[PDB]
Amino acid sequence: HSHPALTPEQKKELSDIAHRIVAPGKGILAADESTGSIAKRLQSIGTENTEENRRFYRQLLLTADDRVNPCIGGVILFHETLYQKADDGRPFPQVIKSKGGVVGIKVDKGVVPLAGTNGETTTQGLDGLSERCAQYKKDGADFAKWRCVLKIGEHTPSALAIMENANVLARYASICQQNGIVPIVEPEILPDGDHDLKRCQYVTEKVLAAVYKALSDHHIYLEGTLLKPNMVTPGHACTQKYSHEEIAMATVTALRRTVPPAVTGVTFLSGGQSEEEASINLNAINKCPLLKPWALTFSYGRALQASALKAWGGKKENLKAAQEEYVKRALANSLACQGKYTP
Amino acid sequence: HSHPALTPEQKKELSDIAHRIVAPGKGILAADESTGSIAKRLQSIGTENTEENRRFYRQLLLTADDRVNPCIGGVILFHETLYQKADDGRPFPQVIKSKGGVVGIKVDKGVVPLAGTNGETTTQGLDGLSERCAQYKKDGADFAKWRCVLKIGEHTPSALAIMENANVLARYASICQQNGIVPIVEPEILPDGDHDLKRCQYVTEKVLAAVYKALSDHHIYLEGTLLKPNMVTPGHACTQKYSHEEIAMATVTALRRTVPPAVTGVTFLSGGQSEEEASINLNAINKCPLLKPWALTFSYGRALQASALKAWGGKKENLKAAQEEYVKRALANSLACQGKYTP
Amino acid sequence: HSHPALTPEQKKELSDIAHRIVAPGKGILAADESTGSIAKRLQSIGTENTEENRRFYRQLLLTADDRVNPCIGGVILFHETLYQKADDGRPFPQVIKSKGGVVGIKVDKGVVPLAGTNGETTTQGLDGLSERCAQYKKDGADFAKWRCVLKIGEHTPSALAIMENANVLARYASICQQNGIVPIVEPEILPDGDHDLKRCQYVTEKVLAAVYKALSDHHIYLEGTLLKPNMVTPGHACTQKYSHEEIAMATVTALRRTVPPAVTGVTFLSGGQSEEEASINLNAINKCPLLKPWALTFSYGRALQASALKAWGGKKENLKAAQEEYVKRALANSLACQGKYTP
Amino acid sequence: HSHPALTPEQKKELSDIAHRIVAPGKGILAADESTGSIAKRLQSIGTENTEENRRFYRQLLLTADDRVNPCIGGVILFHETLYQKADDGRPFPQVIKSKGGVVGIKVDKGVVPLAGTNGETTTQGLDGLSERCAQYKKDGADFAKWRCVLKIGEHTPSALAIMENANVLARYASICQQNGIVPIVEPEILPDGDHDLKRCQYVTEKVLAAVYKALSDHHIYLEGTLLKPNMVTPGHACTQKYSHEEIAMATVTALRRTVPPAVTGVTFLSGGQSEEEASINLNAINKCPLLKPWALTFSYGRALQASALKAWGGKKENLKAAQEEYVKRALANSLACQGKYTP
């Protein structure tokens, strides 16, 4: 017997927002860095960590030129930055929505070790969820983010880690669809270790298949969802060298073997790659001579912003040039969504 | 850790045969009717059941006009009919392969009731499988068929039935890929009962998702496989009336929500429909304004042949006209594969 | 490959505490009633809801006669009542530990509806868990409680509800064993509805088997755990009448068919029964002529205390007599643990 | 909703036969050796392989002294030996039933490699099962045997192997209970390799828990079943030395952590051990100071018979002395069932 999770209207608005996210040429910036993370990056530039610093850095990120307007469809934010206002007086979700962007928010509470395993973890943030996301829906957020972590090793990932991860991810996605906010499924696989393309392709295949089995168990609506996997990439200590074309071919085979086409879009991680290399890989991924029944776009935290970071210097008088560098990468990533990029 | 089931060459030949099955405009005839089934159909025409009768009826089926040659890509056979020869002297697999067809064979051993359930069944035929299919591979068969049965009721299908069915189906498919013969996954849902389109859509969604989870557990190669589901159709005693367009829309939604696009083709059942109605439904299914990343074709036992049955009369002097009627339906089904049919 | 969740010492102390809980003749009082619950019960006696009222009521509950000392081995508490002190000045966990009791605490955050289902729920309280239970371990709590809810209906429980419930319950139990606090598994089945003994026996069998499969997936240590199921009882609107002996026989069959004997003890719910009836049922359950390889004891929230509630009147001058009534039931339940009770 | 697999009468007769199998002091001989196996053992004694040889060897095995009559409760047979008759004229099942024994039969069809894995296998023999076991029930067989194989290695057993193995084992057990013949669950783990007691204990724990989850899925009746696991034993190339007491303690912990007590009996494998060592281990297993809620007995193919083999010489004039040696081991194993054996 069936009792529908969603009315047809709710599925319609989730479909509208999901289509608005991965419109062709439009991509996702991840401004969701937590205080420890952004503190590490601001120690890397060598300045102090204050709220005004984070606010001014996101004043750099969000108030850029109008050339980003057919580039950025949505941006993920931290909980803190929702309630900060710009120097014009406008709150940041209005600044995003004015140039056509959609507000996203990182909602998880970090990582917890799994007992009985070897360094595996699961994610935190299940409690108070409906009230929190309802508040964020009142505050204009329309999609959200949850990040689960898996790593390659001797015998890892175990089936326990994959099973629990997909299960709580489905729990997340159900709660997101209950009030009308789009979830993005992000099964992040660690690129750490030394492993070829083949073992990595096998592992993301199994974990993604387990993910979609779990989602189909929980009566998810697939068009009201997004997918945020990693590009399959060999390990940091892997001595074997590969072309971009082989990585892209393994990526589209690992994607095509499990993902149902009723998912509206697929967006990739940075995954610790270079600023130019991730763009090259995405442009190759779009250039594969196969059939892709979804949107293939970019969701880059560091890869969009680390150049603007390195150009900022922590000093205000640079920002525009820094903003310009930000714009540069965005335009490249825009063409990397459409398969027309060349370096 | 990974140990590959197949060498790249084996995956290549399975890909070649799978592409040759669902080439655009090419479809599957099911001449695999068992002795009780064909005895019932020949009691329906009112003649006796002999081996020469079955042989002559398949002389009608296989030796038709050359107009079927860009229509029938493959045909499923019984074990008996592999070892029968035509009046010209040629064995029937050569007669199929001469006009470009591919030999298929029904290999299961029937249905067994499940204990503890309410009229559910599972399928037989797992033993001696590698030797039997290796013999069939020597005898020219390149793809095979297995039929599992599910029904809608008060609380049925239970999860036990779906789980066991998908599990043994995956066992089948693995054994088929071990020697180089293509399996077709056929999760047949009974149209018996009274139930709307929505409950049926829900049930085929769940059972197909469980199927593909099971297949991904068993390291199946997806491009070396086919899918044989039912069109979602309301029950025989269901009083609610529906357009063909709603059935086709529910079909492509139930298909698009679970099937990975690395499956090469999808072919439908007759499912007890009319001769014209199944063609109308398939032509509508191809005419849906969505994105389908596979081949959508027809696999009709009765629906291709019952007209030729009704035109045969059991008497030899009719056959050509009977064969002509067979050709008629095939041509219609051919256009029904391409979306260009009109009645 | 194996990486042990627990060192042998940790398993040893969990075994010590688990043995100390279900020592023969020792049972569990549930003083864990939330503010809405105890507000409903204090509206039932018709007084106001203050913190001093709740404190004075638990002054009734915990400061009773020394005759309860070989009766109550442990007591479950609310988070609020851990930090309240008695009129002598001693904090309540010291008052429990002085007479030999062990401190327990309810840690979940309530119930959340499941989308796509018909009135099913799952439980809240997974976040901040390690820090909270570590704080409770510093504050003297040694075991904890988590309550998940299932109900009988037309097609409910679905497999989704059972699967998610057992999964998050295992997540709970793992986190409890990580720092050294004993979890009790409580799969509460609703007695609401109208259903015979047989359907109920079937449902608790399936959900308990799924529970222990989930626990064995998560590398739980079974001797460091407890089990808190319901006695199988027909529904409130079930017209069929049954003896206590049939209920007890169905209970020990439903218990013996799934529970591994390396669980240290099993303690039952009140389940909305009468004050005398639950004691009669437990005494019959211990009197079954089968083989029980665990402790079978009582964990009664209302059934131990509702008489003392009805004798209290909200007025201080009664308390001792009220306390006496409390003692009465405890002694009965003590003999009901040992099979020597008669009414 | 519930539809019972068995009527209460059927459960009663399965309970009677299961109680008659593992009555205290009564054990199981495995005379089920296939033609290749018994051909290898008769090549080891250095004679020819004929049907009269196998018949005469089982004339040694079954027609022994009356001292075995409170020792052997049941004996497993091959399909061939059911239809062979003794020199007195009596058929062998009557010879077993005359001295109080119960007829058992090995029904599987051997092992098949699993694709995609590293040397894993699954078992054959699912087809024609109801008719075959119904014939065996007419021919006096009351219980049956099925042998599935798992091995320890680098990353093996995979979850696929365990899952498929438990699934088809449950399918077997259901079919056995459908007509009234008792199944014994035999999850044989290979002792080959080099591995400590701990990894082995972990692996049998997981596979046995998965087994009982699968059995509870398929509505098995637990009192109408038996369990045939291995004693946990370190590998052949494992250099670590262990006492018998540690092996027995790990065995009863691995048993007590998953087996429900509604299983009537547990009987062990030989597992390639010595003739004396397996008896010492079983006598220690019964001598553990824990609580065992079942029968713990011996099911020894080679360990009961290899002495009589080595005393036979292939020549008829020895047999009685050879039979005497057989009796010797049986008596020892009888005391090894009761914990009163000493070497």
XYZ file of C-alpha atoms in Angstrom, chain D residues 3-4 54 62 66 135 154 158 160 165 173 179 197 234 245 270 278 311 320 333:
20
model
C -0.201 -16.939 6.436
C 1.434 -19.816 8.333
C 30.835 -49.117 -1.310
C 25.621 -49.792 9.519
C 24.277 -53.208 19.498
C 10.215 -39.349 -2.703
C 42.942 -11.765 2.334
C 32.849 -11.131 0.904
C 28.081 -11.356 -1.448
C 24.932 -18.697 0.818
C 15.326 -25.158 4.637
C 6.861 -31.594 3.120
C 41.345 -17.795 16.729
C 43.144 -21.704 13.826
C 40.135 -24.711 26.461
C 35.090 -32.978 11.905
C 37.950 -33.721 17.660
C 41.673 -51.410 10.073
C 34.592 -57.318 12.857
C 32.121 -39.606 21.011
